[PDB]
């Protein structure tokens, strides 16, 4: 009794369509029936299937998700004609959240940082809804401002009259509660709309990464460092700010880093060889851990920092007076710049590759990196 499935839609949308095709008038009546059906075979599973649509998704459940998944499998099985798992339609907690880098949710190969998930209102697009009325998954991601098809400019949060749109809350696909048919009625916004499918043309900017999880990583880093939202809600600011930043980058990144360390010298009250690397560089190294890729060809932020640090030390060789390059790094920090582990750094100290300052100097790390790690 299943409906046409699509590859680009949200789990909640599938369920609404599924119930309607069976002659159920309202979701609450349908879910009432299902929760009761389950009590004929597995009571723990039944206790894991809530009646209200807004909490149907897996990412919502803290320690009972185990039972919730089971419940979903029973639905697949009991409804006739079931060649396809519905488990491919929903968010799960992602494994990369360990260490609290940030929270993230997983879907079919891409990790999405949690902060990019919409919560209270849901935009939609009428030129797509007339063709096939179901809700697309990409509409739940904040970066997706503007539709990538049909011109797609200026997608609304309020269709008509006095009310914003939220289809989960009012349980409805084609109409809002005041009765407006949702289906009736700048140029660069597309540079973000394309996050949908990446699909970029060759270009000069750093954001020419083919890995989707890394593209999101990059956007998150930028938001976290510049679009701080101390002052504002960021509806689309990224479209006019991020594109430029990652286009003037051959210089823009060096200017920021070069100013930061010069600025540091001006305020360098204390003898420099007792100052931490972080005291001058502000943990930009730790932030390099936010991008999910570790190899140099994808993690361009770390790659450019090494460029800069190499020349910074190279202009400042060892002399009688503490100078740039005599800043201290931990084994964890050297391990990060050296693309290695902590125990391997300990071995490198133990085997004599580098000395201890009491803990390593920046010159020691850059020199050891250029000297032994190519």
């Amino acid at each position: 009794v299943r409906p046409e499935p699509f590859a680009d839609e949200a789990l909640e949308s599938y369920f609404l369509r599924l119930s309607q095709e069976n002659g159920f008038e309202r979701y609450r009546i349908f879910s009432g029936s299902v929760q009761d059906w389950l009590h004929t075979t597995d009571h723990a599973a039944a206790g894991a299937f809530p009646l209200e649509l807004s909490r149907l998704n897996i990412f919502h459940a803290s320690r009972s998700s185990g039972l919730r998944v089971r419940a979903l499998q029973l639905v697949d099985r009991l409804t006739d004609g079931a060649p396809f798992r519905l488990l491919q339609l929903a968010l799960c907690h992602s494994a990369i959240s360990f260490g609290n880098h940030y929270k993230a949710v997983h879907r079919s190969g891409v990790d999405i940082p949690l902060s990019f998930i919409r919560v209270h209102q849901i935009p939609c697009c009428p030129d797509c809804l007339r063709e096939s009325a179901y809700v697309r998954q990409c509409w739940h991601f904040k970066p997706y401002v503007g539709c990538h098809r049909h011109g797609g400019r200026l997608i609304y949060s309020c269709p008509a009259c006095g009310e914003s749109l939220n289809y989960l809350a009012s349980e409805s696909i084609n109409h809002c509660q005041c009765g407006f048919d949702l289906r009736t009625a700048p140029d660069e916004i597309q540079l973000s709309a394309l996050a949908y499918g990446c699909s970029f043309e060759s270009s000069n900017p750093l954001l020419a990464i083919g890995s989707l999880s890394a593209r999101f990583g990059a956007l998150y880093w930028y938001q976290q460092r510049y679009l701080s939202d101390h002052e504002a809600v960021r509806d689309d600011r990224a479209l006019t700010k991020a594109i430029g930043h990652f286009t003037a980058w051959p210089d823009a990144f060096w200017r920021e880093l070069q100013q930061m360390v010069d600025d540091a010298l001006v305020r360098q009250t204390k003898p420099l060889n007792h100052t931490d690397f972080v005291d001058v560089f502000g943990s930009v190294v730790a932030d390099c851990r936010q991008i999910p890729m570790r190899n140099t060809g994808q993690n361009f932020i770390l790659k450019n920092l090494i460029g800069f640090l190499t020349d910074l030390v190279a202009r400042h060789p060892q002399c009688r007076v503490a100078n740039v390059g005599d800043l201290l790094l931990s084994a964890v920090d050297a391990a990060t710049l050296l693309s290695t582990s902590v125990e391997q750094v300990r071995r490198l100290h133990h085997e004599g590759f580098l000395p201890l300052s009491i803990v390593f100097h920046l010159r020691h790390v850059v020199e050891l990196r250029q000297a032994r790690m190519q």
Binding site: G32, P50, L51, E52
Partner: protein
């Protein structure tokens, strides 16, 4: 399952069907209300002597 409650202060409460009320969630109308009324009687029973 139907649940009926009587108290020494003269109140009566009636849940016509107990099978649908969760730990977390908003209870249906007229039922949410009796939860508030019962909460009040018990709040007193727990806090004022005699």
């Amino acid at each position: 399952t139907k649940i009926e409650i009587k108290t020494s202060l003269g109140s009566t409460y009636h849940i016509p069907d107990a099978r649908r009320l969760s730990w977390s969630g908003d209870w249906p109308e007229l039922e949410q209300k009796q939860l508030e009324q019962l909460t009040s009687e018990m709040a007193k029973a727990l806090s004022q002597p005699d």
